[PDB]
Amino acid sequence: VSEPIFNKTINLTPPYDDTSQTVIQNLSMPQMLSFDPYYESTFYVVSAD
Amino acid sequence: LAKVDATLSKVDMNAAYIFALRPTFPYSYGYKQRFSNRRLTTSALCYAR
Amino acid sequence: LAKVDATLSKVDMNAAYIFALRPTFPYSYGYKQRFSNRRLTTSALCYAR
Numbered sequence: 001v002s003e004p005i006f007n008k009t010i011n012l013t014p015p016y017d018d019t020s021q022t023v024i025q026n027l028s029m030p031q032m033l034s035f036d037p038y039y040e041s042t043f044y045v046v047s048a049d
Numbered sequence: 050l051a052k053v054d055a056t057l058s059k060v061d062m063n064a065a066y067i068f069a070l071r072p073t074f075p076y077s078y079g080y081k082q083r084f085s086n087r088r089l090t091t092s093a094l095c096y097a098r
Numbered sequence: 099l100a101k102v103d104a105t106l107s108k109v110d111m112n113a114a115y116i117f118a119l120r121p122t123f124p125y126s127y128g129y130k131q132r133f134s135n136r137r138l139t140t141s142a143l144c145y146a147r
Binding site: 088089090091092093094 | 133135136137
Binding site: 001002003004005014017019020023025027 | 067071073075078080088089090093095096097098
């Protein structure tokens with residue numbers, strides 16, 4: 001809803017899209033690019049399968 | 050750019066309060082999958098607070 | 099442009115009668131919705147009488 005008013009007459013369910021029934025949005029910042037504040041070491045995304 | 054007109058807490062107190070103190074930040078959302086054939090949300094609209 | 103060939107109620111009476119008296123008017127149909135993710139008809143074909 002475009003404004004933060006919630007009084008049982010507002011509809012928050014997307015009427016014509018059922019994707020949110022099973023999939024949540026990911027609004028997180030990505031992984032941190034460094035797991036050490038002082039020293040830089042390369043790490044990788046690897047294929048697990 | 051932050052502008053809530055001063056001559057608005059004159060005719061409607063609550064609306065001016067809501068606009069001033071609870072801003073909205075509209076954005077559009079979508080998902081992509083490579084070999085899906087399922088519809089999935091493409092250009093949803095939401096308001097982040 | 100209204101043309102049913104005169105040398106057609108010679109070899110096929112019923113087809114000529116149908117073409118002459120019950121014309122067709124083809125057209126294409128579709129629907130649009132903003133936040134659907136449902137397929138919905140896009141370019142159907144129909145014949146209006």
